[PDB]
Amino acid sequence: TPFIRPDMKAFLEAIAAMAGPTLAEMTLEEARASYVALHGMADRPARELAVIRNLSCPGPAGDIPLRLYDARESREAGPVITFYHGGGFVIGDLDTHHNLCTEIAALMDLPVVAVDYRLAPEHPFPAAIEDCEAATRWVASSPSELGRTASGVIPIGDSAGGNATIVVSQLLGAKPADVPVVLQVPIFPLASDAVGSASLEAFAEGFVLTKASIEFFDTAYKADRADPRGFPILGDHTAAPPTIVATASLDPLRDSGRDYAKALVEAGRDVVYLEMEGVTHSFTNIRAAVPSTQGDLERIIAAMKMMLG
Amino acid sequence: TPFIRPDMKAFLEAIAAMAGPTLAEMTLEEARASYVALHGMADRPARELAVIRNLSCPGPAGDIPLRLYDARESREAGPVITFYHGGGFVIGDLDTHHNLCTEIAALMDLPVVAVDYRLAPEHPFPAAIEDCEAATRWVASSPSELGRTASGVIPIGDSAGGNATIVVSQLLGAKPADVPVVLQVPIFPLASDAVGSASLEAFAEGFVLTKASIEFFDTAYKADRADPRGFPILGDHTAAPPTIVATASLDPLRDSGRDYAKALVEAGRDVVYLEMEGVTHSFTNIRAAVPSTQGDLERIIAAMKMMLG
Amino acid sequence: TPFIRPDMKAFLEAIAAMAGPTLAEMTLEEARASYVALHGMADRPARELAVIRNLSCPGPAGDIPLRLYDARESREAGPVITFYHGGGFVIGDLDTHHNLCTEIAALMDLPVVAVDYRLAPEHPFPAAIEDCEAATRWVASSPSELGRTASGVIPIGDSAGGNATIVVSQLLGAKPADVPVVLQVPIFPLASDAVGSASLEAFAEGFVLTKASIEFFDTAYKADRADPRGFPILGDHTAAPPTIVATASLDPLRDSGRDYAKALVEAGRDVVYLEMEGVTHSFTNIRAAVPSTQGDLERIIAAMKMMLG
Amino acid sequence: TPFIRPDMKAFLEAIAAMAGPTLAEMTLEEARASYVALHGMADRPARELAVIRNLSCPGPAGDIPLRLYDARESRAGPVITFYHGGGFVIGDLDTHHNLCTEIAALMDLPVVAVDYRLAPEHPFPAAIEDCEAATRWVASSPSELGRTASGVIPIGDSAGGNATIVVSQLLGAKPADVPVVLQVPIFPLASDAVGSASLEAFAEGFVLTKASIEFFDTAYKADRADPRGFPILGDHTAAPPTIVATASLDPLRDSGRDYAKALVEAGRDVVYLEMEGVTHSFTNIRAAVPSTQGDLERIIAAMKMMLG
Ligand SMILES: CCCCCC(=O)Oc1ccc([N+](=O)[O-])cc1
Ligand SMILES: CCCCCC(=O)Oc1ccc([N+](=O)[O-])cc1
Ligand SMILES: CCCCCC(=O)Oc1ccc([N+](=O)[O-])cc1
Ligand SMILES: CCCCCC(=O)Oc1ccc([N+](=O)[O-])cc1
Ligand SMILES: CCCCCC(=O)O
Ligand SMILES: O=[O-]
């Protein structure tokens, strides 16, 4: 019934034919390893960049590892992209989204700093948020170790990282970092609770991200349902920064992103809503297996350039 | 209490000091002349263009006058902008929005065809819509008299013209023209009935467009409240073309534009929602008297180039 | 490059930006409406006055509508100002010059009666003169409906109204009313035929009043070039009342006003000649858009008090 | 048949009955003495003023005597610079003294009258040289003047109205420290009267006669092509605001009409006042012809408006 691109359908069929186990059935290490293998299989290769460099910053439970990506060894002051990877706050790391980060850095000609935030179940909510916030504030202070000056920050992330993107914009909005959030890019984010949404039921199985996985992530992360830092649809939107909400039409979390973009319009904030038609959750990281998703990423990039001026 | 830009506030003060009659207290021709004078004395001068020429196309009541604007005398096939002026379907014409049209043509480097559609009270609803639709289909057919080949059409219009923009998009969506609507740009449109909205009461007086003027236009035009050609929030949004909704934060019609953008997100359509802060209705045509509004127009132009790819 | 005040020049640039059809290209109703809109946008607001009352008096073609302005609800006998608006004898009415009339009334502390005389082309020359003369004689008779006794009358008017001012003074000079003309104030009048004059060619375009408009008015009104009621330079100046001639240095009709003042001096009559420097025709009614023209009107007022005196 | 006020006519007939000699039939000093006697019997008495003070200023042929008139010992504003009538041959600071006190009292501005050199002893352009130099001196706000000039107002009757215009033109071509903000030529000689209808119509019997005009002309010997002699020939395009006052029974009436017309032709602001039924010299016969006081008060009211 719902529209699906032919290249996207064949990837869904190949996944079904491979017939892997669920996140529940695997051990934590196996589930984390499976995510690495999926993106390593499915995404386009990393871009070659002048700078791919590990860093770290002070955090509230110790140092936070980071990775800086830049097409330029040396550059003028400008906005710095602060990136938070997807993975339910349970899986993913600096390597699962490495190639995507190099693509953003190459296409934007802006530096990208990815954050290796603490994961659940070892570190439940709000550990991930504390680290993403702290690393973003650190970048915003233009520390000597970053090697370039930030005139503003651009939070961006997929899924759980899209959740972190909005929470960070709201936390910096209430208590500003040294420079402002000049643009946020939540990509298929978890913003409102997906429980009860039509997209969750309609796309519960067979569309890369499953209802089973969502429930697995939620049990490990244990976010407070009433806390805007867990579900930022509940935050104060009246001073939200310029926003690009990107969703996928076949995503169980699609309606969550629709809700957030609508809440921004309701509050009179500038927002670009892009719903990629015929593709699933995780489309930013399957750009070789489903080649048309490269074009979806480039639409987000074009919107980001426009929204930066 | 609401934020107003200093150059915007000085314009409102000059209007307040004048202490003129309402549109209903003038004769019909005096209302129309006062709108010529409003834009004439507040807008920037026309751009010089290679082509500005009057023409006409067949319509169901007779010939529809048009004005072609083009920065180039010769150009290859491409999208053609089809422009519908504001004025409540009662006032305005090809001259009240002429300078803005030359500005759109210059900055977009696309041909613009403005429509001199039939006006109420002489021609009630849906006469304006009939002429806007007929002219847009005519342009989309690449007629010889236009001298330009259309690969797509771009409906755009301010206020009542933004209403016509959405209706034309819905009508061509249901019965396609020779080429598709590739993008629509309703600018502070009337999309839903404003009666009862918070913005109507908050900005009923003192913000250029008044509640009394809205009611004066409504009585003359006589749009059917259940008819999606009168109130296109009622229409089918499931296949709406890519859209840029631009509103003003001080507009009694602001919530109508918010509602339409939210409806597009709800239906999963791609939309850029821009709410210009601290300015009023009509900001596209007061670019000399309120210089900051030139920048507002340029943001719409930048959004348009991005959405055209 | 004649001298133009900066605020005057800003106004002429906005008019040039507006562009649009000439008077002859509009319908008659559109032409009249655009004059309403011009003065409505450009003039200072009406003064508050104790008395603003519509009246009428008998005339040779029927009743003549009138408007009385007075800063006082009751006053003793004294001169009454009888005002005739400009507009080429084709456009204008009691409302186009209403704010100026309240200003004259407020600043002079004298009653003002404005005349709604018959207009061309519907009523050719000398219809406007018939009505201005009849209304001035009526006022001079101290009718009960006026509520104020006149010891004298003070004809005053701008442009075509300044033509009427001189003609009325000459007609009452030949055939006295119940009280004399104690002072006349033709403001940028048409006194001699402007065709062939240096100011007509120098200021034919771009100075509010254009040669095309003068020609449009002439074709509608059809004044006889040998008729002193059409061109009162032709009349007998030997008993002209005390006079204030006000002109504008940028007026195509400037030399006509110069001619009339010279003719009064030649006949040994008392005259104040004031030529406002750096402003155009219509300066009495653009006092908000060109704020320095308020001072020009105040000089005329001071000259009037002096001459009364 | 020309209109003449009753009080003005009584004065002309009493002059007619006296049947005095012409200027040519008198000696030069008899001529000057009779002018003193005319204004002495005919003008209203001097006003009481806080300040009536003789001064002097440098001039191109030696010091120019002056008289300052001020209702106030202490007052910055325009300063009136007055040049007396008398054909450039007769008159002095005393013949017009009472008029000067009246102008100072009614304007509440200071008046500086100029004792310029007279013909035939000093022919044209001596009078103009002194009037110009004194006005420039006043315009510099010298310490000895005792008040500060924000501008100057040249004024004068007849020959002094001629000097009023010439001074305004010379200062217009070469500015003094402050501008001429207003000039008041009173029945001026601006254009050559010979040929004018007014000169013939009023050649005899109206205080100023054709014979007197010729007598003054032969003594002063103004160059007829020189704008400093006949300022109708000057450049009017930047004339200051102007009040031209004339008299309807004046042989020089038409010259004042010509000048006011030339100002209007040039687009300059001008009040033209033509006093009805009185003659030349009405500013100085305000006791013998009491209605001429009202004529002067109209000039005063116009000056206040034009300043204003
Ligand atoms: C095995 C492929 C799916 C990996 C999970 C993923 O692609 O990132 C997510 C982050 C957060 C949530 N969530 O908040 O339910 C869901 C998905
Ligand atoms: C003097 C300002 C009136 C015109 C403002 C304008 O730009 O046009 C419209 C305004 C209101 C509506 N409407 O009530 O739908 C439509 C068009
Ligand atoms: C569009 C503004 C200019 C026309 C109106 C105007 O300027 O008032 C006039 C009245 C009379 C005459 N005339 O008798 O030539 C000219 C002008
Ligand atoms: C004996 C009475 C006449 C005295 C002279 C007079 O009335 O003052 C004049 C000043 C100048 C000129 N002039 O310049 O021809 C004429 C007259
Ligand atoms: C929903 C209306 C269908 C088409 C009506 C029209 O052409 O104006
Ligand atoms: O026009 O309120």
- Chain C closest-CA separation from residue B209 CA (Å): 16
Angle, helices C28-42/B28-42, rounded to nearest 10 degrees: 50
CB atoms within 10 A of CB D200: 13
Question: Does C38 sit within 8 Å of B34, measured CB to CB?
Answer: no
If 0-12 CB within 10 Å is exposed, 13-18 middle and 19+ buried, where does residue D203 land?
middle
Q: Whose CA is nearest to atom 7 of ligand 5?
A: B130
In chain C, residues with a C-beta closer than 8 Å to the C-beta of B40 are 14-15, 17-20
Helix or strand run (H / E) with residue A138: helix A127-140
Count of H-run helices and E-run strands, chain B: 9, 8
Specify the 3-state DSSP secondary structure of A282. coil
Task: Report the distance separating Cα D38 and Cα D282, nearest Å.
Answer: 12
Structure token pair of residue D296: 């002067």
Determine the Cα–Cα distance for residues C188 and C273; give it in Å rounded to an integer. 11
Helix (H) or strand (E) holding A151: strand A150-158
- Please say whether the beta carbons of A307 and A271 come within 8 A: no
Element (H, E) at A294: helix A293-308
First-to-last C-alpha distance (Å) of chain B:
40
CA torsion D1-D3-D7-D8 (nearest 10°) is -90
CB atoms within 10 A of CB B28: 17
Provide the sign of the torsion angle of the four alpha carbons B279, B284, B288, B293, taken in this order: positive
Phi-psi label, residue D207: left if phi above 0, alpha if psi -120 to 50, beta otherwise: left
Separation between Cα atoms, residue B288 and residue B279, nearest integer Å: 14
Say if CB A133 and CB A171 are below 8 A apart. yes
CA distances from A22 to A218, B253, C62 (A): 15, 50, 98
Phi and psi at residue C29, to the nearest 5° = -65, -40
Residue in this structure with the two tokens 């569309």, named with its chain if needed: A207
Contact criterion met (CB < 8 Å) for B306 and A309: no
Nearest CA in chain D to C277: D267
Whether the CB of A198 is below 8 Å from some CB of chain B: the reply is no
Phi-psi region of A91 (alpha: psi -120 to 50; beta: other; left: phi over 0): beta
Q: Which residue's entry shows tokens 């004689």?
A: C137
Pair C163, C150: CB distance under 8 Å: no
- Name which of B249, B270, B271 is nearest A268 (Cβ-Cβ): B249
Q: Over the range D252-262, which residues count as b (16 or more CB within 10 Å of their CB) and which as e?
A: bbbbbbbbbbb
Q: Are C257 and C191 in contact (CB under 8 A)?
A: yes
Buried b (16+ CB within 10 A) or exposed e, B170-208: bbbbeeebebbbbbbbbbbbbbbbbeebebbeebeeebb
Question: Quick check: C204 and C252 in contact, CB under 8 A?
Answer: yes
Q: Which residue in C33, C4, C11, C96 sits closest to B42, CA to CA?
A: C11
Return the number of other C-beta atoms located less than 10 Å from residue B64's C-beta. 21
- Chain centre distance of CA C201: 22
Which one, of C136, C134, C173, C126, lies nearest residue C157 by Cα?
Answer: C136
How many angstroms separate the CA atoms of C187 and C243, rounded? 11
Among C268, C269, C273, select the one facing D269 at the smallest CB separation: C273
Give the span between the Cα atoms of C183 and B276, in whole angstroms.
Answer: 57
Q: Which 3 state secondary structure label does DSSP give A54?
A: strand
The CA distances from residue C95 to B10, C47, C75, in Å, are 26, 14, 25
Q: How far apart are CA B177 and CA B152, in angstroms?
A: 9
Q: Which two tokens stand for residue D247?
A: 């008299």
With an 8 Å Cβ cutoff, are B33 and C29 in contact? no
Distances from the Cα of D40 to the Cα of C31, D100, D253, angstroms? 67, 14, 25
CA distance D188 to D85: 9
> Is C37 in contact with B41 (Cβ distance < 8 A)?
no
B278's torsion region: left (phi>0), alpha (psi -120 to 50) or beta? left
Alpha carbon distance B262, A259 (integer Å): 9
Of C169, C255, C281, C296, catalytic: C281
CB atoms within 10 A of CB B43: 27
Q: Is the dihedral of CA D244, D250, D255, D257 positive or negative?
A: positive
Q: What type of residue is C100?
A: L
Which residue stretches of chain C are H helix?
A: 6-18, 28-42, 98-108, 127-140, 160-174, 198-202, 211-221, 254-266, 293-308
**What gap in Å lies between CA A268 and CA C46, rounded to an integer?**
39
End-to-end CA distance of chain D: 39
Residues 6+ apart with CB under 8 A from A59: A130, A131, A134, A135
Please name the residue of chain C whose CA is at the shortest distance from the CA of residue D301: C306
Alpha-carbon distance of C260 to C255, in angstroms, equals 9
H/E run at residue C68: strand C64-70
**Residues D116/D56, Cβ–Cβ less than 8 Å:** no
Exposure letters C85-102 (e unless 16+ CB within 10 A, then b): bbbbbbbbbbbbbbbbbb
Q: Which ligand ends up closest to the CA of D189?
A: 4
Token pair recorded at residue C34:
């655009």
Ligand 3 atom with minimal separation from the C86 CA: 10
Instruction: Give me ligand 6 centre to Cα B209, in Å.
Output: 8
C281 annotated active-site: yes
Where chain D is broken, by preceding residue (C–N > 2.5 Å)?
75
Distance CA C260, CA C273 (A): 10
DSSP H helix total and E strand total for chain A: 9, 8
Q: Does D236 touch chain C (CB under 8 A)?
A: no
Q: Which domains does chain A have, with CATH numbers?
A: 1-309 (3.40.50.1820)
Query: Which tokens is D291 given?
Result: 């209605």
For residue B63, how many other CB atoms are within 10 A of its CB?
12
Establish how many alpha carbons lie within 13 A of residue D122's alpha carbon, considering only the half-sphere containing its beta carbon. Answer: 15
Closest among C229, C254, C223, C244 to C302, alpha carbons compared: C244
Give the Cα separation of B62 and B106 in Å (integer). Answer: 31
Tracing tokens 């489309």 back to the chain, one arrives at A283
Q: Are D117 and D61 in contact (CB under 8 A)?
A: yes
> Do the Cβ atoms of A168 and A174 come closer than 8 Å?
no
The three-class DSSP label of residue D263 is helix
Helix intervals (H) in chain B? 6-18, 28-42, 98-108, 127-140, 160-174, 198-202, 211-221, 254-266, 292-308
Return the number of other C-beta atoms located less than 10 Å from residue D202's C-beta: 25
Is C155 within 8 Å of C129 (Cβ atoms)?
A: no
H or E element that contains B153: strand B150-158
Task: List the one residue out of A144, A147, A155 whose CA is nearest residue A179.
Answer: A155
DSSP D48: P
HEC assignment per residue over B249-295? CCCCCHHHHHHHHHHHHHCCCCEEEEEECCCCCCHHHCCCCCCHHHH
Is C300 part of the contact surface with chain D (CB cutoff 8 Å)?
Answer: no
Report resolution in angstroms: 2.1
In terms of DSSP bridges, do strands D111-114 and D77-83 run parallel, antiparallel, or are they unpaired? parallel
Q: By the 8 A CB rule, do B11 and B42 touch?
A: yes
DSSP string, C230-291: T-GGGS--TTPPPEEEEEETT-TTHHHHHHHHHHHHHTT--EEEEEETT--TTGGG-TTTST
DSSP H helical ranges for chain D? 6-18, 28-42, 97-107, 126-139, 159-173, 197-201, 210-220, 253-265, 291-307
Q: Which two tokens stand for residue B154?
A: 């771009």
Quote the tokens at residue A65. 């590892």
Say whether the peptide bond before residue B291 is cis (omega within 30 degrees of 0): no
SS3 B150: strand
The pair of structure tokens assigned to A161 is: 């990282």
How many Å apart are CA A211 and CA A204, to the nearest integer?
A: 5
CB C178 within 8 A of CB C140: yes
Q: List the single residue in C29, C37, C46 with the smallest CB-CB distance to B37.
A: C37
Which two structure tokens, joined as six digits, stand for B240? Answer: 């709406």
Our measurement of the distance from residue C258's CA atom to the centroid of its chain's CA atoms, rounded to an integer in Å, reads 16
Q: Locate A152 and state its tokens.
A: 């503003």
- Burial class from Cβ neighbours inside 10 Å (0-12, 13-18, 19+) for residue B96 reads buried
CB D154 near ligand 4, within 6 Å: no
B265 touches chain A (CB under 8 A): yes
Alpha-carbon distance values, B262 to A272, B163, B258, B266, B268 (Å) = 12, 16, 6, 6, 10
Closest CA to B113 of B90, B141, B87, B88: B141
